[PDB]
Design a protein around this nucleic acid. Sequence first.
RNA 1: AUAUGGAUUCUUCACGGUAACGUAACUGAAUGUGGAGACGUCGGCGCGAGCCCUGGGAGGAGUUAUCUUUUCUUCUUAACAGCUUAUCACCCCGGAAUUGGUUUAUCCGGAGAUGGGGUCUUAUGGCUGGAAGAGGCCAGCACCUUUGCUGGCUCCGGUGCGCUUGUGACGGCCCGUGAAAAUCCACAGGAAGGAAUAGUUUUCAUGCCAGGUCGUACUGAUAACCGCAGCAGGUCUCCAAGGUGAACAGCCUCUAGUUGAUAGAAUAAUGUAGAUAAGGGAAGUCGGCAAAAUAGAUCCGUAACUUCGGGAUAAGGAUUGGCUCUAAGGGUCGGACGAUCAACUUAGAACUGGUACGGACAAGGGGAAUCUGACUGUCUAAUUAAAACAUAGCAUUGCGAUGGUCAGAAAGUGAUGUUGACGCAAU
RNA 2: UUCAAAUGAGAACUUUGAAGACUGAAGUGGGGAAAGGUUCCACGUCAACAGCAGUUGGACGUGGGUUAGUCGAUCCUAAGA
Lengths: 112, 63, 77, 106, 50
Amino acid sequence: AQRVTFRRRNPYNTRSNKIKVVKTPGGILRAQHVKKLATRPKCGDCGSALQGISTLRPRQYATVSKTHKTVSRAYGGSRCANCVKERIIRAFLIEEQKIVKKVVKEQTEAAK
Amino acid sequence: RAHAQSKREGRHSGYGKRKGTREARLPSQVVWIRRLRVLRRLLAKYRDAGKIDKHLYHVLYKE
Amino acid sequence: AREITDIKQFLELTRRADVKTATVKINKKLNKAGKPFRQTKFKVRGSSSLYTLVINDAGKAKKLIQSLPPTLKVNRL
Amino acid sequence: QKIAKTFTVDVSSPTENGVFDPASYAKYLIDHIKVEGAVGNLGNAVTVTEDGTVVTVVSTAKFSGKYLKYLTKKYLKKNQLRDWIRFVSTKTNEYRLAFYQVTPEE
Amino acid sequence: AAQKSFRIKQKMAKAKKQNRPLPQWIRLRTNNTIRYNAKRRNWRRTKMNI
RNA sequence: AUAUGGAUUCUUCACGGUAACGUAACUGAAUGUGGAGACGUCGGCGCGAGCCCUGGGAGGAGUUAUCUUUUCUUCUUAACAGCUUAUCACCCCGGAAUUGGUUUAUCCGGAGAUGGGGUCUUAUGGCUGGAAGAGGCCAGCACCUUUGCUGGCUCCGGUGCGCUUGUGACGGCCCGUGAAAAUCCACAGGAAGGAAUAGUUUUCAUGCCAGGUCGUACUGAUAACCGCAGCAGGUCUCCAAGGUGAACAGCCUCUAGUUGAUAGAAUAAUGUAGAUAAGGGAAGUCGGCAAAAUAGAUCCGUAACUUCGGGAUAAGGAUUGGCUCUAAGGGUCGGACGAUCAACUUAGAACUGGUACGGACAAGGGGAAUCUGACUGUCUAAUUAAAACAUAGCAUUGCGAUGGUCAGAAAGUGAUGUUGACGCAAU
RNA sequence: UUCAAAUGAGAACUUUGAAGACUGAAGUGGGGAAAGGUUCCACGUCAACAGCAGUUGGACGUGGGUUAGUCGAUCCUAAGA
Ligand SMILES: [Mg+2]
Ligand SMILES: [Mg+2]
Ligand SMILES: [Mg+2]
Ligand SMILES: [Mg+2]
Ligand SMILES: [Mg+2]
Ligand SMILES: [Mg+2]
Ligand SMILES: [Mg+2]
Ligand SMILES: [Mg+2]
Ligand SMILES: [Mg+2]
Ligand SMILES: [Mg+2]
Ligand SMILES: [Mg+2]
Ligand SMILES: [Mg+2]
Ligand SMILES: [Mg+2]
Ligand SMILES: [Mg+2]
Ligand SMILES: [Mg+2]
Ligand SMILES: [Mg+2]
Ligand SMILES: [Mg+2]
Ligand SMILES: [Mg+2]
Ligand SMILES: [Mg+2]
Ligand SMILES: [Zn+2]
């Protein structure tokens, strides 16, 4: 039955003007402005959410330690484990194929 | 409170008291969701307890 | 505000350089919905945070009050 | 379960001023305290005693200070003392009868 | 408006300080021809137009 | 700006886990890369918060002619911090037809399902600190005191297709696929720098200093704005209780807020606004104009025509109160069932009042045809809402960029054009 | 809309108490945006204004009142200039 008001001078229901109702130690209801929820960081190769990375607004990442923003692996953070594995496999196999093709081309030049 | 107690006992629920449609008073989709959840809960309980096997469970799930 | 549970850590906090004031608060509570008992909260006022140590033993609380440093300004009750 | 609860009422001020009857009040409580929905069913459950200044009700079956206050106010209304005497609580389960604020006539 | 600019607030302050009747000692001066404030402004009669 | 503690190093720039990955830390210049900022609408389902409803107990108030263990009311917990908490997603083992798992909604699996064990995001919730010392509800002190002061309680539960709102995983839709930038972080790379009786690390903790300028009252409207006014007009948005009832409808109520608009005395005619009427039932009138009749919900039943989607609530019939019962529809735990808990839907049967039972409120009149415009939509603000305009579909014409259709006084000028015949332009 | 008291030279219209009603949470409630600019509040006070009245007032006279590292502007860019 207790009705509430905006605590700021914006009277419209915009994306930055969202409120929730909270009961205070004074025994009354009051509005409380809620910030926009954070979005999980995404992988650079597949676009999926990154496991083990904290979910914060972009300015808030400057306030936390390096543990909350990385994982202990190559490309930890920016890329996910499956994509890192796939690019490792691709790198090794393509380098081996390049060596094979160079040897084959040298043999073909010699025989031709 | 007295009127609510009478309604819980079953009074004042006749055709002369109904003013919305049957769907408006109680959604048939809500009824179906309750019933199907009950059936799936029972089938899962029987399969996990071992009272039925998985092939019979699959057939009864489809039915 | 932070809660501390290590007694040695509490003593180090009381002897920290920036620490000047502490508060002793007494509460009357019930243990497992039984007989009344006495709870003592020691609150050390740091520069950034206020540290609270909660002791449910009256004798240990009295011993800790006796063991508090003398230059620390203690506000009782 | 059935732990005995004791409620005390202090009628000393109206009794000394001579507008109250502790024996009549105790008899009214005996006659009108309900157990399991009926009056006169106080068999080995509720005991009401009085000694001229204190009325004691010891109960083991669903008795509350709110009910005791309700019955005392009913008795006060029946004796037409509702506008002058009220039922106050001093501590838990101990109560008294007090006169309302009266200015001297002068 | 509540959230106003300083230029507007300064003009409002000047108008507030101008809002007054004549001092009584003006009327006692020799050869005084000023008998009332002919430029008096009220909030519900003439709008300031910014 | 900086110091101490912590951490790391004689294997210099950490260890652990098969892995997903974890942590109090654990150097990093040029350059490149990635992410966040950063995004439509609708529908159902899940979860949270506030509100709604309700029980025991401790206080206060009201009623008490009769009755009511009664009716109302207080019993609260912010930002921030620590631990913990999840749908989705991912990792290890394993190798599936008698195909299995599974949502309200039918998708997934040898590109590795079911199953067992784990990892992570912390929306969100719980415990504790903040914090009872606050706030709330009561009782008791002396007084001309414009002055002071003491005691108690503030606890434990329950419920749901409930309302509002936030959010998650989804599904539907498009010839519509539904912002940018400041800013922040991370990765790749390793120019370099750095220890033995001594170094490193200010992305770990603690300690020190600072944060300027302008706005901030109040109304926001049947009297603070505009309409020459203290004008029945106009003017964007947030919060939102109980009953009846499908319902933010109508009617009544709690919190809060008003009681404003020149008044008094009589009750003629004529009016403005609202009603009733014997018998007949459109005989009135240019014309059924206006009123009346209908109306909610349940059941039976429903024609021509048709683009097969509709027509349709077609039409035409029966019922509706109260009371006392009966039957059906579930959850949580245990090994044919038992214990316990709880909600509102439907159907049926007796009895009973009646001149009335959607008892006020609320709320389609229906049908047979003709002309006309396909439909939804739009305009003459202040006399015309239509057959007028638009529309989708159809058709014709111009143009391959040194171009078509247009613009500019001119220009090293411009629109289509971030365009290219499935396009643009003119009809 | 009504009764009583107070104030006042004067009360249908001011104040307090006692009553009857209304808005009925899509309000006649609690806040704001645009706009207004002191209308906010106190004291004093009735010539003119409040289409009656007036001791009352958004009227008249004299003053008081708007405090930010965290709410906004300030910064960024949008169609555009
Ligand atoms: Mg419904
Ligand atoms: Mg359906
Ligand atoms: Mg303000
Ligand atoms: Mg305001
Ligand atoms: Mg105006
Ligand atoms: Mg004008
Ligand atoms: Mg007639
Ligand atoms: Mg005729
Ligand atoms: Mg005729
Ligand atoms: Mg028809
Ligand atoms: Mg048309
Ligand atoms: Mg017109
Ligand atoms: Mg017209
Ligand atoms: Mg046309
Ligand atoms: Mg009304
Ligand atoms: Mg009303
Ligand atoms: Mg006048
Ligand atoms: Mg005023
Ligand atoms: Mg003034
Ligand atoms: Zn990836």
